[PDB]
Amino acid sequence: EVQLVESGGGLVKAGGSLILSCGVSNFRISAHTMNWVRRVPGGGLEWVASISTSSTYRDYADAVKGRFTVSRDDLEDFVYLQMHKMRVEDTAIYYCARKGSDRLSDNDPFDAWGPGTVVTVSPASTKGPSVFPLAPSSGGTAALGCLVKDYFPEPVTVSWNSGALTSGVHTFPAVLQSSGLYSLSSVVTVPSSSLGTQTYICNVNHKPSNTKVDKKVEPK
Amino acid sequence: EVQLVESGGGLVKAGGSLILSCGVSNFRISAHTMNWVRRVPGGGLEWVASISTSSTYRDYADAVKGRFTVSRDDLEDFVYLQMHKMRVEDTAIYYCARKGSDRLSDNDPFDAWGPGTVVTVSPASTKGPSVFPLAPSSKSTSGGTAALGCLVKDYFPEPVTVSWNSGALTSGVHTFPAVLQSSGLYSLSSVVTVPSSSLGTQTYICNVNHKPSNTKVDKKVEPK
Amino acid sequence: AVVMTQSPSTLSASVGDTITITCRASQSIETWLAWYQQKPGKAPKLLIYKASTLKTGVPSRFSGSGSGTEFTLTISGLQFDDFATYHCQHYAGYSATFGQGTRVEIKRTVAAPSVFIFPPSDEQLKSGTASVVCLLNNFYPREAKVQWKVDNALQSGNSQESVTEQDSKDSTYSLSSTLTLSKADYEKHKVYACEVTHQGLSSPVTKSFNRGE
Amino acid sequence: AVVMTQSPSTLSASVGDTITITCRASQSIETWLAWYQQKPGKAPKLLIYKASTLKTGVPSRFSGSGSGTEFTLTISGLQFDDFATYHCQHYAGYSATFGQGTRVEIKRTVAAPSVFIFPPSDEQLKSGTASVVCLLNNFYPREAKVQWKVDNALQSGNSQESVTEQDSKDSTYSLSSTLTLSKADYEKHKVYACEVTHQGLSSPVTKSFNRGE
Numbered sequence: 001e002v003q004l005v006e007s008g009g010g011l012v013k014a015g016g017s018l019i020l021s022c023g024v025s026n027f028r029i030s031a032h033t034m035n036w037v038r039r040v041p042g043g044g045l046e047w048v049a050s051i052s053t054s055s056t057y058r059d060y061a062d063a064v065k066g067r068f069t070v071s072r073d074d075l076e077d078f079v080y081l082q083m084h085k086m087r088v089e090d091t092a093i094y095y096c097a098r099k100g101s102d103r104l105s106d107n108d109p110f111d112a113w114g115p116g117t118v119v120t121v122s123p124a125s126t127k128g129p130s131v132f133p134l135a136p137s138s139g140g141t142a143a144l145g146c147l148v149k150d151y152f153p154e155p156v157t158v159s160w161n162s163g164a165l166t167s168g169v170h171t172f173p174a175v176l177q178s179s180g181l182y183s184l185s186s187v188v189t190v191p192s193s194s195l196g197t198q199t200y201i202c203n204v205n206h207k208p209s210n211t212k213v214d215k216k217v218e219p220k
Numbered sequence: 221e222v223q224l225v226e227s228g229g230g231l232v233k234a235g236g237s238l239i240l241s242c243g244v245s246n247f248r249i250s251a252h253t254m255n256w257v258r259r260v261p262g263g264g265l266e267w268v269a270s271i272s273t274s275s276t277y278r279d280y281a282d283a284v285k286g287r288f289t290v291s292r293d294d295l296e297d298f299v300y301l302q303m304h305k306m307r308v309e310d311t312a313i314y315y316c317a318r319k320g321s322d323r324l325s326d327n328d329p330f331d332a333w334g335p336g337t338v339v340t341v342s343p344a345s346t347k348g349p350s351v352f353p354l355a356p357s358s359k360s361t362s363g364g365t366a367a368l369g370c371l372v373k374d375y376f377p378e379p380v381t382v383s384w385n386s387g388a389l390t391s392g393v394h395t396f397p398a399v400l401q402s403s404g405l406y407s408l409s410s411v412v413t414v415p416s417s418s419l420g421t422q423t424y425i426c427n428v429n430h431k432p433s434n435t436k437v438d439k440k441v442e443p444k
Numbered sequence: 445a446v447v448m449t450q451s452p453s454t455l456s457a458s459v460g461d462t463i464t465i466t467c468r469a470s471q472s473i474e475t476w477l478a479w480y481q482q483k484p485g486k487a488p489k490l491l492i493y494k495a496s497t498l499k500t501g502v503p504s505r506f507s508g509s510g511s512g513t514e515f516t517l518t519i520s521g522l523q524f525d526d527f528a529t530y531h532c533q534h535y536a537g538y539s540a541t542f543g544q545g546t547r548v549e550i551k552r553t554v555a556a557p558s559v560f561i562f563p564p565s566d567e568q569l570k571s572g573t574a575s576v577v578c579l580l581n582n583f584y585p586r587e588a589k590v591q592w593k594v595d596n597a598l599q600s601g602n603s604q605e606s607v608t609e610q611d612s613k614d615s616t617y618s619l620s621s622t623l624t625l626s627k628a629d630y631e632k633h634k635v636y637a638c639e640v641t642h643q644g645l646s647s648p649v650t651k652s653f654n655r656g657e
Numbered sequence: 658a659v660v661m662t663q664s665p666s667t668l669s670a671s672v673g674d675t676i677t678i679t680c681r682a683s684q685s686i687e688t689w690l691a692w693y694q695q696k697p698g699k700a701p702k703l704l705i706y707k708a709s710t711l712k713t714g715v716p717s718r719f720s721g722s723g724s725g726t727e728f729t730l731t732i733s734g735l736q737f738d739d740f741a742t743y744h745c746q747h748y749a750g751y752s753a754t755f756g757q758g759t760r761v762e763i764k765r766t767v768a769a770p771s772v773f774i775f776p777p778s779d780e781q782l783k784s785g786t787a788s789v790v791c792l793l794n795n796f797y798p799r800e801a802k803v804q805w806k807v808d809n810a811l812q813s814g815n816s817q818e819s820v821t822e823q824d825s826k827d828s829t830y831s832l833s834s835t836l837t838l839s840k841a842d843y844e845k846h847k848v849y850a851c852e853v854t855h856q857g858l859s860s861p862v863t864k865s866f867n868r869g870e
């Protein structure tokens with residue numbers, strides 16, 4: 001009868017954050033010290049955190065101190081685990097577990113566990129953009145630009161010709177692709193009669209990954 | 221200066237779950253009713269949930285009743301929002317917001333807000349695999365045996381089943397545990413060792429079933 | 445269960461103008477009404493509560509009035525810093541409801557977009573992906589629609605777009621739409637078109653190209 | 658902050674055997690010790706607590722003993738369902754420590770893997786990605802080392818492995834390693850190799866191919 005179930009597992013990039021929750025059935029958490037435990041890919045279990053009745057004591061594994069917070073919600077029977085500054089070695093299956101026995105004592109084993117929720121921390125905490133030309137080709141007025149694609153996290157900055165070119169420039173809000181990476185475009189309108197004479201170069205900077213990219217946009 | 225900061229936003233699959241937290245600086249949440257509000261793509265704000273002092277009352281927008289839960293932690297000053305059975309129209313920026321004023325009353329406006337965290341629910345709950353042959357060649361042939369297989373890549377979620385020649389070929393088959401890529405999609409391989417003498421005479425086809433997307437693919441794996 | 449209706453949805457005006465935003469409640473809420481200002485990508489900011497009380501730090505050009513079911517936010521002498529979205533809000537002890545929001549923008553004459561379409565660069569194609577971009581440049585007002593057609597079949601679920609904030613100099617907007625396909629699908633088809641609908645046009649505009657050319 | 662050391666890490670046995678897993682604590686923990694069984698993909702199960710108390714429902718073939726610093730879990734008459742991982746645990750009021758776990762597996766003779774390599778398919782390559790697959794077939798024991806080398810340069814951070822569970826028929830394991838590169842990266846190199854080290858192999862086996870054949 002007594003059950004627990006964890007929610008919130010997912011894929012996160014190094015340095016990112018993820019919050020897990022745990023619900024129960026057929027008992028109240030109020031009288032129980034609640035625990036988080038994880039099974040790392042090697043196969044061993046690691047105790048992660050504990051929160052006592054009334055939240056009087058919250059205790060953490062050294063490996064997660066300063067980065068994880070456990071909370072409890074007695075009125076609705078939930079326990080939470082916040083994970084920040086996450087690292088590759090946080091990759092594991094996370095279980096919610098209660099200390100319990102037919103009669104509660106000052107020190108009981110983990111008698112009930114949830115099925116677990118999978119947490120994965122991918123190693124790269126950033127990724128620099130790929131830049132592609134948007135090549136020109138309405139007369140008199142031409143439009144060209146750069147497509148800044150597949151980067152993370154925000155922001156990028158875009159200048160044109162190291163900044164000498166500011167008029168007619170539009171740098172668009174980035175969009176978040178289904179891939180979880182960002183993409184944006186920067187475009188400029190110029191005299192249809194400067195393409196091939198005037199050089200056009202978009203200057204992309206992605207501070208988070210110390211990446212700088214200059215790209216010549218030519219006709220065709 | 222009072223501050224609030226949300227954590228936990230990201231990309232979620234329809235049907236999925238996501239939990240947000242909210243932490244504060246330069247005040248204690250205990251005397252304050254705390255709220256969650258979201259700005260939808262159309263630009264309007266939507267009240268999502270509220271939790272009173274002492275957690276005496278929790279209230280929810282009808283659109284989320286039954287799927288969201290709000291919780292508070294007065295001792296360390298956090299507020300939580302659990303989001304389950306997520307829908308595309310849950311897509312929005314989520315803000316944590318304090319109900320308050322210079323001196324509290326039974327009914328104050330939202331006087332301090334977090335910067336917001338972006339939550340995006342994709343319409344696709346599922347994605348079907350690409351299947352590529354692991355063709356037998358001189359590099360996977362030795363003596364009396366040849367190995368061949370299929371690489372089943374970029375699907376979501378687990379599981380997929382793999383059969384060879386519709387179940388006729390079972391001896392020697394190994395279908396490996398799927399692995400999760402940094403892209404958030406799974407991939408796995410299924411391989412089988414067969415007599416080298418049979419390539420060119422026996423046809424070999426991997427039957428891939430991704431039930432979650434109700435997708436089936438039959439892939440003929442041939443030399444070279 | 446109190447529905448808050450804000451009007452208008454967009455209010456175009458000029459610096460120096462006095463403007464009025466109305467908020468209506470489906471039933472009496474006495475003076476339990478607040479107004480917030482929000483700029484793109486920033487948190488809402490409380491301006492007025494109890495219908496007419498200004499928060500500390502809110503300039504005196506902002507005022508609010510009303511009770512029961514009809515409320516008004518007034519801005520006397522619009523400044524540049526004031527162009528933003530305004531949200532009214534009924535607040536109760538343990539719940540709240542918001543109006544749809546009102547975007548206050550700079551008024552100018554209608555302007556049709558200039559439209560451009562860009563095929564994928566050969567480089568990107570080589571890496572397996574094909575992003576086609578459609579640009580709608582310097583149009584007004586902000587509402588515009590983009591429909592992608594591939595060999596004349598309307599697309600859906602495979603495009604995203606973003607719109608710039610109102611231009612500082614000519615008060616126009618621009619929009620960028622990206623249609624994304626695998627290299628495989630892209631090569632299955634010949635005609636890629638972006639069709640743009642906007643009040644500045646007498647009818648929808650199409651820009652297209654044939655793959656390969 | 659107690660260190661718990663199980664022994665052995667892998668325990669190879671046959672059905673009907675009587676086997677003993679040891680758990681040592683780096684300092685005395687009286688009898689505050691529990692044993693858990695866990696099967697792949699499933700939740701840990703409490704078997705024994707306070708060093709020797711059997712949880713109701715647990716078959717009498719499971720038996721726990723010990724105190725202070727040394728503890729044993731004994732299974733008398735090992736049955737097929739007992740093949741699993743076992744974890745000892747020091748439990749205190751507000752924290753716990755686990756051992757590294759002991760996986761109990763079916764005993765068999767050492768068996769070298771057969772190694773096969775698969776270049777990326779032309780179809781995938783065209784789509785912009787190169788997966789190179791190294792297959793280690795039917796080996797024992799489970800411990801194997803696989804290293805990728807691209808033009809003699811050892812690779813790190815760009816491969817993933819998957820190991821099968823013990824084979825129902827020959828008690829062997831099989832393993833797959835996938836090296837993933839962008840088409841562009843993949844095309845910058847010539848020789849791709851996987852080097853396999855294993856206790857049953859006299860020396861390492863290296864399988865290789867040249868990109869382009």
Ligand SMILES: O=C(O)[C@@]1(O)C[C@@H](O)[C@@H](O[C@H]2O[C@H](CO[C@H]3O[C@H](CO)[C@@H](O)[C@H](O)[C@@H]3O)[C@@H](O)[C@H](O[C@H]3O[C@H](CO)[C@@H](O)[C@H](O)[C@@H]3O[C@H]3O[C@H](CO)[C@@H](O)[C@H](O)[C@@H]3O[C@H]3O[C@H](CO)[C@@H](O)[C@H](O)[C@@H]3O)[C@@H]2O)[C@@H]([C@H](O)CO)O1
Nearest residue numbers: 031032033052053056099100101104105106107108750751
């Ligand atoms: O409020 C009171 O009733 C009381 O006045 C009772 C007093 O006795 C006293 O409680 C303190 O001392 C108690 C007894 O201490 C002595 O006898 C104990 C044997 O009964 C012995 O172990 C101990 O060393 C000593 O010799 C303790 O039991 C009290 O500890 C409980 O309460 C505090 C909160 O004040 C908790 O922090 C403790 O973890 C513990 O609560 C847990 O155990 C009790 C049962 O013993 C449960 O009822 C309770 O729900 C909780 O159980 C959960 O947590 C434990 C530990 O993780 C798990 O093993 C369980 O499975 C549950 O998950 C306290 O020290 C006074 C105090 O002075 C202040 O009130 O309180």
Ligand SMILES: O=C(O)[C@@]1(O)C[C@@H](O)[C@@H](O[C@H]2O[C@H](CO[C@H]3O[C@H](CO)[C@@H](O)[C@H](O)[C@@H]3O)[C@@H](O)[C@H](O[C@H]3O[C@H](CO)[C@@H](O)[C@H](O)[C@@H]3O[C@H]3O[C@H](CO)[C@@H](O)[C@H](O)[C@@H]3O[C@H]3O[C@H](CO)[C@@H](O)[C@H](O)[C@@H]3O)[C@@H]2O)[C@@H]([C@H](O)CO)O1
Nearest residue numbers: 251252253272273276319320321324325326327328537538
């Ligand atoms: O000593 C006590 O605590 C006391 O004895 C005080 C008693 O008055 C009584 O409290 C109840 O009655 C109070 C007065 O109610 C009457 O007058 C009010 C006008 O001032 C009127 O609105 C009301 O309808 C009635 O006519 C109420 O103020 C009390 O309500 C407060 O306390 C209860 C808990 O008992 C909370 O659940 C309420 O939400 C409210 O607390 C909130 O407001 C007060 C300020 O008045 C804050 O101090 C408190 O931190 C909290 O503030 C936060 O939440 C509100 C609402 O979301 C926001 O608007 C704020 O910005 C904050 O976010 C109560 O009904 C008795 C009780 O009967 C039992 O003790 O308590």
